[PDB]
Amino acid sequence: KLQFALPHETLYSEVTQVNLPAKSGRIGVLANHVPTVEQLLPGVVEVMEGSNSKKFFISGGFATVQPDSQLCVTAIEAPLESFSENIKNLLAEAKKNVSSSREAAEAAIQVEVLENLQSV
Template sequence: MASPALPALLDDAHAFSLQIISLSAELWSGDVREVSLPGSEGRFGVMAQHAPLLSTLREGMVSVYPVAPEPPLHVYVSGGYVEVQPGKVIVLADLALRSDDLDHARAQAARDAASSPMAQEFTDADYARLHAELMHQRNLQLRGLPWK
């Protein structure tokens, strides 16, 4: 039996509306063919005509597979809820960031840390010396000896 043609898979019967909303604003909405979610009891997927469902979400990535021929979208959520209806899914996240925004935020945090005054004060040798001294003091503390 021949497999169905791709356009037949992308018709309205195989698509549903998805909204991803965080506390600050709507992050994304559109028609999708599938979404994968980090449920509190484990990861699960939703496709069109899914049975109604209300679930809590744990921290993780929501993977969105749009109907349009474009790559999947990944959205980080820190937790929240998802409501699934046969033609619509609503993700209510505490915090939500698109993966490209998350990568940008991580890069900016790394740049900020590298340019901080404390980071500029320590050379590799200074850092190693300080780390060794702290480890020595912690070792003395764990053995019950007085700090020197």
């Protein structure tokens, strides 16, 4: 089915449709989708197991449909709601940080996260 797993938690260890943002744009996986390995970009993820749909904000990871149709999703952390106003404030400060500064790359990643936040 689907393994959706975090180090200290598991979100959804027969899932029908999953919509994922990956290094391949956005990919949707529906029942049998031929087996892939794609690194998951930091993401806003929707998982539908049956018609029921769960909305996640996910810190990226790696995605792998297995040949046995075990959709191994591994990601570091997440719900959408948990990520969600103060975060918007903090990111403005972080945006300021990009002006100065690995720390340079880090602040750039923070801007990428700001884009990811903007998606919400």
